[PDB]
Amino acid sequence: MNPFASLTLTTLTILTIPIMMSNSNIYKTNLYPNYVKTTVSYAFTLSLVPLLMFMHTGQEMIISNWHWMTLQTVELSLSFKMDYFSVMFIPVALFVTWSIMEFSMWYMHSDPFINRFFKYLLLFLITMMILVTANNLFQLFIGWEGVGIMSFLLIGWWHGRTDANTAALQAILYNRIGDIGFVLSMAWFLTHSNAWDLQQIFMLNNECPNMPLIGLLLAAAGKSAQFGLHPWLPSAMEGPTPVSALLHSSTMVVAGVFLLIRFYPLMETNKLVQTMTLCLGAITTLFTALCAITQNDIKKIVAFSTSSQLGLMMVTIGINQPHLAFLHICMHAFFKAMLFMCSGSIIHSLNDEQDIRKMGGLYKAMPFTTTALIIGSLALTGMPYLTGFYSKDLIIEAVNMSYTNAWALLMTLIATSLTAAYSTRIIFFAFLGKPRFPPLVLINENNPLLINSIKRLLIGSIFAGFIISNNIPPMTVPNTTMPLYMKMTALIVTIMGFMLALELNNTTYYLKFKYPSQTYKFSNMLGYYPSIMHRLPTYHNLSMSQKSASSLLDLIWLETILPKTTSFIQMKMSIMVSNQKGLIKLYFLSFLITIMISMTLFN
């Protein structure tokens, strides 16, 4: 037998194993975090093996091991699609999760429920693996909702925090609108294709229609926090830093992009949905970068950077370049996870301080996190030969060289410049200058766990792009011929954003105070979208829930029509019948009238 299926299913099963040990003395002791981390590392190597198998001969398989149920002519079975996407995403996700779990062993030392935290992280990893390897729509939806509910559980990790509860419920709401779209797509696919699996969907849908493709697009936008459904991702920073580093930025928010990638044949068949995806990605990346360039919370800045990168990936899908989107998924996972880990290290060193206005002097205060963050920012902005170069540069070239929307192309370029701008802002306000933190210096980054996790995610941020780019087979025709200025477009806009942001940030040293502008207020306050869209619609819906449905209809009029009017009529008639004075003269005269009526009327 080919070791492919055995090794892949073994990686999944050994990921599941430590959950079965969650009712044991090992779960009761303090060895559970290290136990889970070791299991994740072993799974990572055991999943690297099938990646080596694929890199040689390009082997791909489907494993429908267990048959769940047959609904007349529709068979649902537990099937895993071990293809290029799965065998490339699994090792990357496992590597990132391993690094995050070690960083969490360092970072969450004082948490009373660190064992439960590690169990939740492992459960999220299991659900994400189910989502990635799912071969049919029902199993994909299982993974979808699993990662959604794990996000809900981990965002509101501190149950006593009202803001945490609000953020968790907000994420659930937006992902549930996405699930509305997903269920629309699933229902259409079943009705018009008699199956819920990719093989038959691809066979029967030779020209996929707008209704299923728009359903998929809505689900992807909801899960990946595109414009319209974006605010939940930045608000998801209420959870602990390991949750933000692993779940949201790196692995979970790419679920919608991955879903769109998995239906790239249908996306190729359609054109209107491709245009809508391109425009949505462009507006998302521009808006989120513009909001990012003026935030004062480092976690917020990194979250908006993640949203902008998701918008760029959606742009990549919209120009019919699905494989570049997956490559960017991997590279972004690497360097964004490292950036979030560096931000968490800074926060922990400065005693839970998440304000760049209070950070400063960390370039020499903390050498290793400083160099790691600089490397991550250079990779994010597209340093000419780092991990982000082998995806972002190709994405920009494809955008320039394709039959794209002019406004979408312009917004993509401006978003790249603003990416450079907010990376400059992070570095400038976090490491350069004089200290602004409280005088009691508790800075200490000499922990081997933190150092080793950042080291593991740091070698990937430099070399992984080259290796992955040179090992994958050519999935698309390259853009060999192009003008020199159009080749340099990404670098030129990156340098321009760097210089402009650096000049504007250096202007802050002047002893000159000026009131904020309308554009600054719009950008800092997230475009006013959370304010209006979180106060007006919710107020109207909740007011209608009680004023109209509960009070006016349920408690007033539905009571007035059937039960109250009938009872009132019965009471009135009963009073009328029983209101007799007991006078024989009266009711004997009534008898006479009755006798005459019977004699005359009835014949």
């Binding site: 769940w68 149920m69 609904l71 007349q72 029902f138 939806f141 299982i142 909702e145 699993g146 509910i149 809900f152 509101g156 149950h159 006593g160 009202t162 509860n165 968790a168 419920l169 659930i172 709401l173 549930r176 609108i177 699930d179 509305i180 779209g181 269920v183 629309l184 699933m186 229902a187 259409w188 079943l190 009705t191 209704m211 819906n541 909740l542 209608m544 829930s545 009680q546 449905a549 509960s550 209809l553 349920d554 539905l558 009571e559 059937l562 039960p563």
Partner: protein
Amino acid sequence: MLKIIIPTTMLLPMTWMSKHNMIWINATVHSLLISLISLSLLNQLGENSLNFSLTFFSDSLSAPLLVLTTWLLPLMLMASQSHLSKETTTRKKLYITMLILLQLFLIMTFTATELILFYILFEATLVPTLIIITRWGNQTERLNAGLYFLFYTLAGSLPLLVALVYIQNTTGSLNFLIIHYWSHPLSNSWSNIFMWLACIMAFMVKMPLYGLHLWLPKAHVEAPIAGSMVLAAVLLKLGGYGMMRITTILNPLTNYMAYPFLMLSMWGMIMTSSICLRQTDLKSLIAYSSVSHMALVIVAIMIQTPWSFMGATALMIAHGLTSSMLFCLANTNYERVHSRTMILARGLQTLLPLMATWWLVASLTNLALPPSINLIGELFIITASFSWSNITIILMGMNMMITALYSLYMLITTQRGKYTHHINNIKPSFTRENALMALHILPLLLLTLNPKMILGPLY
């Protein structure tokens, strides 16, 4: 079916002859034994039903409901023994007798092979329920709740009796097999319209349909814990079972008379979810959630496709289990603080951890979280409604969003936050309560493992 009916009629003398301190033990043990015996009905055929005799028969639709009833009886016994410690021995025996009679009537209802016998038994289920509500309810509103429940159900059901006797006179038999093999099309006329109205309106009132539901909040809020458990788990499913059984002879008139009921069910599902969003009472919240789920079942039955019936059956079973569990959790919190206000007791996540876990699992099953049978049934109904029309997806999506919103709102309000400072009588959760929650939740996950057992004859 006598091997299941007679053991209950022997449970009655056991209850009335047991010692004063052994009534609960005996009733629980032998109810569990009867449930184990009744598990045998799940071995159904692929072609026809199980016809035991001229009076009782079992089907792939009747079997899961019977198993649910037999499994639900001991849970009601546990909750009742929780809240009836100070009652006299005679009144404890009377309460157990009422529960036993209700289970016996439900079993005979689900196994009755003739429409008139089914009517007699499903009407007989009112008397024990009314006695339980109006006698062992805590609040002053139990009397009004019982009146509302009784009169809604009877005003629905009397025209059903007239329709059944008229059908018997016209066709010669009310036996279900005869009326299925000898079914004839129902021509479009006022007489057939009113026969359809009589039957469907009786079962809609039993469902309940939106606009005919007030008795459900009234009864469920004001009934004792056992009464609330049986009202939502099984008694609500009598309407769905009847509609599945009675719609054999109502075609093709159902294709045209279903529009008002479908519109009512969809819009009232949305309205009751929105009501759940703004409820100040936990029992009322659970009752309106039940209303929304049964409205979805009504939609499935009315659209009347093989894919809708399977989803309807699965949703009925899943909703029964989930509603019983939610009512039990609310009753435990009520026994802690002697009040049903949802915001009175908070911080129960940090006051009672494992009970918070039970709350989380119950709320996760309440919303359609895959691969739970709740999600299986809801998804089948949504797909069938999508095939029916392509805006039903809009309505179902809105309902799902509001369902998740109010479920997690209940969970966060009851569990998360900071505990009430002045509430200091919240003792650690009892082994009995935890066992009750475990017995509520584990069969749900096992049915998730094996889903074809609750998908009905259409599977």
